[PDB]
Design an enzyme around this catalytic site. Structure first.
Site, short mmCIF file in Angstrom:
data_model
loop_
_atom_site.label_atom_id
_atom_site.label_comp_id
_atom_site.label_asym_id
_atom_site.label_seq_id
_atom_site.Cartn_x
_atom_site.Cartn_y
_atom_site.Cartn_z
N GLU A 58 -12.42 4.84 -2.37
CA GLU A 58 -10.99 5.07 -2.33
C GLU A 58 -10.72 6.49 -2.81
O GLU A 58 -11.59 7.36 -2.71
CB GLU A 58 -10.26 3.97 -3.12
N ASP A 59 -9.52 6.76 -3.30
CA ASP A 59 -9.04 8.12 -3.50
C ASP A 59 -9.84 8.80 -4.61
O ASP A 59 -9.43 8.86 -5.78
CB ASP A 59 -7.55 8.10 -3.82
N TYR B 172 0.84 -1.19 0.00
CA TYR B 172 0.00 0.00 0.00
C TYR B 172 0.88 1.24 0.00
O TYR B 172 2.08 1.14 -0.26
CB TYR B 172 -0.95 -0.01 1.19
N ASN C 268 0.49 14.55 5.65
CA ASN C 268 1.13 13.33 5.18
C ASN C 268 2.52 13.57 4.61
O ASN C 268 3.46 12.85 5.01
CB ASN C 268 0.22 12.62 4.17
N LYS D 188 -5.30 -1.86 -0.94
CA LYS D 188 -6.03 -1.65 0.31
C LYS D 188 -6.77 -2.91 0.72
O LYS D 188 -6.85 -3.22 1.92
CB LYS D 188 -7.00 -0.49 0.18
N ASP E 147 -12.53 6.03 3.60
CA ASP E 147 -11.44 6.00 4.56
C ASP E 147 -10.62 7.28 4.53
O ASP E 147 -10.09 7.70 5.56
CB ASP E 147 -10.54 4.79 4.30
N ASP E 148 -10.48 7.90 3.35
CA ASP E 148 -9.76 9.16 3.27
C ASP E 148 -10.46 10.26 4.05
O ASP E 148 -9.82 11.26 4.39
CB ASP E 148 -9.59 9.58 1.82
N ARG F 206 -7.57 11.20 -7.02
CA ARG F 206 -6.80 11.86 -5.97
C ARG F 206 -5.93 10.86 -5.22
O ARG F 206 -5.96 10.79 -3.99
CB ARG F 206 -7.71 12.60 -5.00
#
Lengths: 556, 556, 556
Positions: free
Chosen positions: C232-233, C89, C395, C160, C255-256, C142
């Site tokens: 996801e993103d 990941y 991050n 993931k 999750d983001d 993203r």
């Protein structure tokens, strides 16, 4: 393989799967908790089979059994082949064809139509088995005694292949029944809501020729040039034309033409053992038809030339009569084949005066007309030759040239009789009891097919069929010859087939016709290795171990 | 067929499946929304392939591509076979064998061990493809330049079969790589936690002989007697023994023995075109080894007898020297094969004095010893014969009997040189620029295998390999002969193979060796129909209709 | 099942198939004659894995292992999850996305494009597994730190989901990675010959909304309404919009957005155990972003209200600063969400004067700007509150608001620090050695997903994520709290996940959210029954017998 094992007739054993086989195949629970040998399954099938009051219902049960468990199906057939051959094949198969009840549960056969020209390989791909050694293709045009049945004729290949295995030994898994549906010239079927065919007039000419050319080409491309292709009930014109067309190009043969002739010549050569006389000392009067007596005549001429008789005086001994008299030079309508057996002779009007004129030792009547062997013919033939030969090879018993008891009475019980229709035992005075032989095509095509498939024979020449006739003639014992029987009992057909299959095989390796290269020393045990038996296989995995160190799991 | 289509390397096309193919196969969504021709896939594979800094990594990528999409794998190979042959086969395949990284993703090959004796048919059933025409079995005992690799040798059949298709045209789906694991006499591998083999001493004797007997028998029972079985890097003793054992019983051959000899004789016959002289006017001095110069000598004797030279004076022209001198009558240890090429002659000690004594036109050195062609030998050979022949056929370039530039200098640029190790172009004074030919086994086994599989040839005699050598000798153009090149460029191997495959085929039909019966008139177009090409197939169903009335749904 | 067992990663065990398993599955011969435990396979994979010099090559090896043998893949991952989580990941999965090398051998994921609208159920049918419990769908818009990757983003769901199983316990066979390819607004990818995507501008608006609506509808029609769908993103705008759209209609979460907030609130609640102080006695200054500090703020408000604090004074304690100053009534561009945390206060220009103005106990900085926690802020915050809280949750370590050693120096070694970027251990004077906690989303989504899939929870409300944060806060031991560590070590993630999965489950059964009806008494042992373990199954058929009379074959 799971639930699909019980749907495959070549794998399904029903309640004969042992508990270990059921557990290994993943089919435990799908089968009743009853473990049976094949003998108990056979007796249960027989008990259910005798409950039926018609032959059509027996046929339905046998075809359903073939759709469920084919090893049990062939156990049934080979158990008593004499009583099931008339049920899975003619005469019952035709009566079931004309009276289909949407029978076949599992798809049994390949329907290839004229409208599929150019895409026949794709249709051959639809058949699950891809290793096919025999193909029985039919047209439905000339079903035995029934006429044009069109797409209803599918039962005839399916039936005949069932005899390839029940009588011969052919694996019924490298066998493929094909029906070439080109339409049907049967108004009864065209105007029928339950007809399963194309419902238009039968296509002929170059379209039909191209369809069959592409069919042979596709069958040999997919399954090899060694694929045995037998032509089923085609029209006699089409039958003979296609036979001569594909005879030397493919491993092709026709049983309605060549098997019939082989059985007839086998009966003749067997009667030769009763008369104790050589074939050279014989003269034959026929009742020529549309390639019915012509094939018998050609095979008999070949048998004559085999004894060192040149072809001229060999064909000298053949006379043909069909509703017009003899075949002498250009009588009225001699074709290119009738002229081959034409004798330069005074033109004779009917049968009686030619049987009187040239004294015949054997009269081979295949003309589909009844009573053509009148009493005076039998009587003066018995007077001319001691122990004569009478062959009423017409299939409809209502149209047989003679009858068993008539031939045995008028000839004073010394006329060797044989037919193609079932004649029961004739008991006469003077203690003369005769068992008249019944010529059956199942004597020839199973053994020839088994030999051809075993040896990979590339072409089936007429020498193979003469050899088959000779072997069948040798099959009859002296005890049966004393009873006036000319063909071996069908209860031994398997063995007979095997012997034929070996002799044929021998011939193929003596004349460089067989493709199987390793050239077996023991051809008897080689053919016996390919004979399919109804005995069940074992579906248990072969487990074994390694010597305790090569088998170590090798933990860190 | 769904998701399983993308796991079958023979079916998967990756992003070359068109949208209609993806929708029909039920794999839409499993592949990125990118539709590619095979050329774009090839360029992407090449871009990824040039990123690697080692030959082992290139090998890993190529083997992974073979596990994913084999048509793209053979597109890669056949795109530039000269640059990928040393990667998927020797020398890189051995360096990858010794340095396995648990490579093969998809099961590629069949591991049959000595502990499986009696159950080899069950193991052959594990292979998914059931129509197998070629089997490359290895022992792992004598991998080229690497020694006993045991079960690590599986890359050698897998590699060589990849050359059956990249160089020949063999369908890489009727090819089966087998590894017979009988143990390994390699202490480095026995004491290795990452070894994938049996981890015991190599079994020999009657157990090994019975294992190989049962292997040949099972391979021919399952796949036919026409299955071509090639023996890979076996020990030279075992190699020659098993070759003589199964030569005339199965369609078996050995490339380390017979392909090498064929390539050597092809180089010799090509050099004959430079000297413009007949083979009869030649004498050969060898450097005999353990069935390395023996096969070359036998094939060269056969080439001599082909020109009408009796075997006596044919084998007269062969002299063998190996660390002891000539082979004269019972020198010290003459075996039954050395005595065949033994000349009744004064015993000579070393190479120099025999090259001086009998004036040789061709010295064929395969002895795995370096510098054995000293300067004085080359010089006095060039002095004896104008345009001599020097063959340093030793595979390790560190152990070649001579070198390209040395042979070309000492012979004053007129010594026809050829080797088995890659020697770059030699440019000398006087404008003498030579491209020394590189003998490669890939000139023989692909074409011979393609011809044998096309024609169904039953046995591969030495005449076939002499014929292959002759065709390869004819492959070289005059322009290349002027450059001193004795073998055609590998970029044409496909075409070369085809030609060989035809000539071989011709021979098989001229001497009744081929099983394919229909006997093609155009054998060129017949072999071309079996040549496998990396071009993708079309997975779209062939749709068609019926003439608007036979297709009617027939509602009540 | 034969050769296909070795191609199924969920079934293939490689050389861990015992001899009996190989013989029963019909795969004997396809695998080398080496029998291995999973430990030896793991050590061999590790030996091959350490040979690589880049993280991309390690990723290639791990993805290939997942394509070959997924149980060994998850053995590898769960062996040391802390060292493989950054490889399968982020951060390595993005660097591999941007630098694809045509990686995935086995089809791993479902590519659904905008041009497939109306036919998404047919594409879901392409996935081999039909019992799917979790779906991680991405847009590629993203990707973390990489930007719009389009169809290259497929590695992110695939990665993931690999953490769903390695960290959680989710069966990696009821998991489905989906990539919704709507185009890409990435000119680097549009002008790229090796791009595997659609190669047009990213579709937005009603077409995109309808595509995602039909996707959720098709996923829930095929796999049930209990199918957990994680987003996801996606772009933060799309992310939050679709989250609010499908939050209460499907079992959907992001999750983001929600996992990040849960991890942040978990770190805060863990720091509460260091300060020994209740959450009510805290005030929070943020660095608000595009749904980065907003979710943390909402979850923190929920945590406050949980302690009996009304929502008014609960949201009173939140201050937001982003490049403009505080969020006071209608400053310049307050949206409908910024106004929720808006304090009626004098408008403050920058960060320093608001940290001075209202004395904060915790500063949660997620703004993607570096050095925003200047020395004076840390110093006067340490002076205001003993033991303050500093959260540099940005991050990119190059863009973190502060640094570990800076926070620990300027606060005199009493500032509780936590980040989202890996900060090594900081050793200071006075013997002050700190192990700064690293917030990881893998603390939340695996456990929440395992609980949701175990209990069949229908919707995932924010209470579930607050509960997850509380459990994670309780996971840290006192020994780690003394070291200044706020999150449990990843080497225990499995256990942590389990505990979360139980507590979540409890909540779902306390608030009537779970669908699994039987309502387990022991939810610990119920969840433990669904946790997937890398331990191999046994492929040997379960054999048993019957009591010797019910098993009789019953011969006549």
């Amino acid at each position: 393989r799971g639930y699909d094992v019980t749907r495959n007739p070549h794998l399904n054993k029903g309640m004969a799967f042992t508990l270990e086989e059921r557990l290994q195949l993943g089919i435990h629970g799908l089968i009743p908790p009853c473990f049976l040998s094949q003998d108990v399954q056979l007796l249960r099938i027989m008990r259910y089979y005798e409950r039926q009051q018609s032959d059509l219902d027996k046929y339905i049960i046998l075809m359903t059994l073939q759709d469920r468990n084919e090893k049990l199906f062939y156990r049934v057939l080979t158990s008593d082949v004499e009583k099931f051959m008339p049920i899975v094949y003619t005469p019952t198969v035709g009566l079931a064809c004309q009276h289909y009840g949407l029978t076949f549960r599992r798809p049994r056969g390949l329907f290839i139509t004229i409208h599929d020209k150019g895409h026949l390989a794709t249709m051959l791909n639809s058949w699950p088995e891809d290793n096919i050694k025999a193909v029985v293709v039919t047209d439905g045009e000339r079903i035995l005694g029934l006429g044009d049945l069109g797409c209803y004729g599918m039962g005839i290949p399916v039936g005949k292949l069932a005899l390839y295995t029940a009588c011969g030994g052919v694996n019924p898994q490298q066998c493929l029944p094909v029906l070439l549906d080109v339409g049907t010239n049967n108004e009864e079927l065209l105007r029928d809501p339950l007809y399963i065919g194309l419902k238009h007039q039968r296509v002929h000419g170059k379209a039909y020729d191209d369809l069959l050319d592409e069919f042979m080409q596709a069958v040999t491309d997919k399954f090899g040039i060694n694929c045995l292709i037998q032509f089923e009930d085609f029209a006699n014109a089409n039958a003979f034309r296609l036979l001569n067309k594909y005879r030397n190009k493919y491993c092709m043969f026709n049983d309605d033409i060549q098997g019939t002739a082989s059985v007839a010549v086998a009966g003749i050569l067997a009667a030769l053992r009763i008369t104790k006389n050589k074939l050279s000392n014989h003269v034959f009067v026929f009742q020529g038809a549309g390639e019915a007596a012509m094939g018998i005549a050609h095979l008999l001429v070949m048998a004559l030339e085999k004894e060192g008789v040149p072809k001229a005086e060999a064909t000298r001994k053949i006379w043909m009569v069909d509703s017009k008299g003899l075949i002498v030079k250009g009588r009225s309508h001699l074709n290119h084949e009738k002229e081959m057996f034409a004798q330069d002779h005074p033109e004779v009007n009917s049968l009686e005066e030619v049987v009187r004129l040239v004294k015949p030792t054997a009269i081979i009547g295949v003309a589909a007309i009844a009573g053509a062997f009148t009493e005076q013919i039998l009587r003066d033939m018995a007077s001319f030759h001691e122990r004569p030969i009478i062959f009423a090879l017409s299939n409809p018993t209502s149209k047989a040239e003679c009858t068993a008891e008539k031939c045995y009475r008028v000839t004073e019980g010394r006329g060797i009789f044989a037919s193609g229709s079932p004649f029961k035992s004739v008991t006469l005075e003077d203690g003369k009891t005769f068992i008249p032989g019944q010529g059956n095509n199942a004597y020839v095509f199973p053994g020839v097919a088994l030999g051809v498939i075993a040896g990979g024979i590339r072409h089936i020449p007429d020498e193979i069929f003469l050899l088959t006739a000779e072997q069948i003639a040798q099959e009859v014992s002296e005890q049966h010859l004393s009873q006036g029987r000319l063909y071996p009992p069908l209860s031994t057909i398997r063995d007979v087939s095997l012997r034929i299959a070996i002799k044929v095989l021998d011939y193929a390796y003596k004349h460089n016709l067989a493709s199987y290269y390793p050239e077996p020393k023991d051809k008897e045990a080689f053919v016996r290795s390919l004979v399919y038996t109804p005995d069940y296989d074992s579906f248990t995995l072969d487990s074994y171990t390694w010597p305790k160190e090569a088998m170590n799991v090798q933990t860190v």
